[PDB]
């Protein structure tokens, strides 16, 4: 890999610089290089990995949605034929998005997840695995769509089981996991009632644990609780 000659610490330092410069493709490449050094990642390093790829795939998803919408309208009754260009370019973006998801999933499988023993790291990585299978599911149309969905579900489910056993209901990773699994139910699995129930139970169990927290931890937890509430308001 092109980062093989750079020190781990220098890759981490440059990932932080790239974040400040809003150079998220660079940030992801630096963090990929850091992961490939083979050592476990610290809490801060895991955050850098997730932020980097969130922003890269986020640009691709937003572009894919724009193009998909244009493509669907071109398939409307009365739309003038414009040739293969819209489909071709949507396919190009889609292929690049799938490639980014495959890269992230490959880092998790080789070998972040298997080396992650603490609940905080293992849940973090399993949530990521669910997230990137979910992004694959958003664009999937063929004979593996069901298997992609089930892969997202299984990763999220293993993460939920660990987080319920090992983390308090206000833990921000536990909360963001439940939030995203709820989005999976609503947007991917066609299970809006499951989505609503999970978001409500997660919110209520967190509210009841807030009294145990410091002011700073309270701020961290209530921020993600507000996102659960925002979804519930949209969905009900």
């Amino acid at each position: 890999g092109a980062m093989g000659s750079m020190e781990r610490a220098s890759l981490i330092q440059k990932a932080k610089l790239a974040e400040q410069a809003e150079r998220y493709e660079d940030m992801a490449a630096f963090m990929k290089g850091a992961v490939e050094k083979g050592e476990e990642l610290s809490c801060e390093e895991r955050n850098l990995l997730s932020v980097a790829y969130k922003n890269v795939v986020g640009g691709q998803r937003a572009a894919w949605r724009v193009l998909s919408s244009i493509e669907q309208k071109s398939n409307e009754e009365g739309s003038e034929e414009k040739g293969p260009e819209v489909r071709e370019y949507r396919e190009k973006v889609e292929t690049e998005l799938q490639g980014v998801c495959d890269t992230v999933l490959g880092l998790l499988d080789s070998h972040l997840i298997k080396e992650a023993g603490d609940a905080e790291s293992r849940v973090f990585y399993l949530k990521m695995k669910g997230d990137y299978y979910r992004y694959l599911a958003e664009v999937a149309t063929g004979d593996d769509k069901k298997r992609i969905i089930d892969s997202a579900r299984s990763a999220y489910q293993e993460a939920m089981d660990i987080s319920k056993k090992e983390m308090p209901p206000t833990n921000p990773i536990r909360l963001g996991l439940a939030l995203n699994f709820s989005v999976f139910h609503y947007e991917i699995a066609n299970s809006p009632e499951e989505a609503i129930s999970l978001a409500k139970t997660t919110f209520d169990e967190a509210m009841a644990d807030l009294h145990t927290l410091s002011e700073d931890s309270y701020k961290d937890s209530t921020l993600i609780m507000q996102l659960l509430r925002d979804n519930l308001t949209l969905w009900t």
Binding site: N47, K54, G58, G176, V183
Partner: peptide, 9 residues
């Protein structure tokens, strides 16, 4: 839109 969340303090 985006109703999800991914970098914790």
């Amino acid at each position: 839109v985006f109703x999800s969340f991914x970098x914790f303090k």
